[PDB]
Design a protein around this nucleic acid. Structure first.
Lengths: 99, 54, 82, 80, 96
DNA sequence: CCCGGTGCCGAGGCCGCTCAATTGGTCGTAGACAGCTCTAGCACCGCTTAAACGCACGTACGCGCTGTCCCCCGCGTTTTAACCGCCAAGGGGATTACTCCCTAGTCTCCAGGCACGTGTCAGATATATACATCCTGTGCATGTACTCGG
DNA sequence: CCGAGTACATGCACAGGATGTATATATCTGACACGTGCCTGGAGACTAGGGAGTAATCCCCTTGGCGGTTAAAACGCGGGGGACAGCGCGTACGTGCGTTTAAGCGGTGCTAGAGCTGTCTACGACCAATTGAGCGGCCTCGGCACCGGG
């Protein structure tokens, strides 16, 4: 009696929604703390600008979006609807990052 | 690394093959020169594990 | 006989290229596709090199123009100068 | 073109080269030291019987009285 | 019997060890002159230019065959396919 | 998802000042163009033959199907913190003072880059011997079946 | 009818031998390798002149730090559809053999233009004065953010 959608319907709905809008999908403050952690490890006593942090967030989110596109292409080429760490490693391998 | 590869090949003279082995065998030398093609240096011998018989 | 210069790249030659590329088994449809990608590559490099040759007011394409075309295409090569 | 008549083939070279040798027709065969045919289950017996031939000749001093299977294999090879 | 493939495999190994251009010189040069004829008529070419084009072309095809073979292996197949090539160039960024 | 209402802060237009763009004027130098040449690119043709093309055959790999087992997916409720405003003050930037570093010019001079000929010298090919792996043959021991005796 | 035993078949292990493999060696040759002098483009030394950024303050925004509010992250559940393994059918992709072709060689002939060179010159860096296009700043306003019913 409780209504439940079949698996993948809400997934495609989220594909159309998040592909539809421009908003950032990563929370601001945790990503800022990660940037301050890595940058703090590289060089101590560093200060940052909001525009720089938002730039890192834009570049990172877009890079992960494209990497998820090529990864999905790797899974579909593998005849699987589910992406896998081997699909990611193949995507970065053909991209030449880890090659 | 080129002289090391030449010693591994039992040659006292550096050849483009030795330069290719030295550049490609090193990770950082392969990162900078990965877009560079060496003439008459060949490539590192490689055989995939799935291509081996039995 | 009459045959195309793109067909001048032989199936055993592509087979040797794949053997150097570490390919044990090659499908029959690989050869024509490789000829296509090859033609695309030469159309990409030769266009830029010939453009340098035209900017140089020369009717002879040199090796430096090729090295520069590969350079701006990320194909940069060593040993021919530059 | 067939500018050859008599040839000499090694025992192992006939097993490894049997692919090339089975494509040619021979009207006769000669065998020196034929004691290698004492085993009927060996590959040399079936390989020798696979080639099409008319007459066969085997010259050996082998002691066929030791095992009856050796004399029976030599008689069944020429006359099956 | 000893495992076949023997000689042929030995010649693959030796032909990979000794470095030479695998594409035929005169046909490749005719292809280069044909492709360049469309861009500019009455062109002349240097031997070092043609050899450079053949080196870069053969190297590009070797790398593309490596990534293509990686695609085939990722597809649980030992045979490369035009879809493996198209995926290789797609992830490379040369198309689509 | 589309539609009518309200609302607000960011878009877009005006004011004013200044510093860069512009106008005028000079020197010289890299270049445009013609003159000469000599290398290399082009064309051609024949002897050699290695590679390519075509075809046969079958063996192993693609690929399609099926079945299990689970590992994500959708939904409900529960817990954490991201997010939106104030308040010091710590830095990022204006303003002034001043010197070590580089620019520019002109001789004086060590150094490398070829033209040429000479002498080595690794090192590209091949050949053969030494090593090793396994394929085949031979021999010995054990097991199963049939025959005979009690 | 059952058990003992002899005979024939068979299977496993060891040793010989053949073929594949790899390195050690030999040798003549393209190419590193090494003088011999040239010189002209460099490399540095030595005065004189310029100049921009270091250093010290100091005014002023933009950070980093306090307490709430709900909105999203998280935890769980259940079953469902997707991954992965097993298996088999088919065909095509590999390998070998024979026929065919044009690729590699290097020998000769010819001229086209990349390159060196020599002369004369318009264009731009450069410097000084003048002018208005652009930009910080400020304010008014309206395009779209937000929202609740269809």
């Amino acid at each position: 009696k409780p209504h439940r959608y079949r698996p993948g319907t809400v997934a495609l709905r989220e594909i159309r929604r998040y592909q539809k809008s421009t908003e950032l999908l990563i929370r601001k403050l945790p990503f800022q703390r990660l940037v301050r952690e890595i940058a703090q490890d590289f060089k101590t006593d560093l200060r940052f600008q909001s525009s720089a942090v938002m730039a890192l967030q834009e570049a990172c989110e877009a890079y992960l979006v494209g990497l998820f596109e090529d990864t999905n292409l790797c899974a579909i080429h593998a005849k699987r609807v589910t992406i896998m760490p081997k699909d990611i490693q193949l995507a970065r391998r053909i991209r030449g990052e880890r090659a | 690394l080129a002289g090391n590869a030449a010693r591994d090949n039992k040659k006292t003279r550096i050849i483009p093959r030795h330069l290719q082995l030295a550049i490609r065998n090193d990770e950082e030398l392969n990162k900078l020169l990965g877009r560079v093609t060496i003439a008459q240096g060949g490539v590192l011998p490689n055989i995939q594990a799935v291509l081996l018989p039995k | 006989v009459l045959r195309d210069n793109i067909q001048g790249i032989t199936k055993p030659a592509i087979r040797r290229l794949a053997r150097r590329g570490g390919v044990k088994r090659i499908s029959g449809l690989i050869y024509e596709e490789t000829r296509g990608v090859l033609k695309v590559f030469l159309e990409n490099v030769i266009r830029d090199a010939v453009t340098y040759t035209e900017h140089a007011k020369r009717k002879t394409v040199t090796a430096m123009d090729v090295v520069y075309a590969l350079k701006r295409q990320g194909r940069t090569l060593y040993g021919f100068g530059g | 073109d067939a500018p050859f008549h008599v040839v000499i083939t090694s025992y192992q070279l006939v097993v490894q080269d049997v692919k090339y040798f089975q494509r040619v027709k021979w009207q006769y065969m000669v065998l020196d030291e034929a004691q290698a045919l004492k085993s009927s289950s060996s590959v040399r017996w079936k390989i020798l019987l696979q080639f099409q031939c008319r007459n066969r000749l085997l010259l050996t001093g082998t002691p066929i009285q030791n095992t009856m299977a050796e004399l029976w294999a030599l008689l069944h090879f020429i006359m099956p």
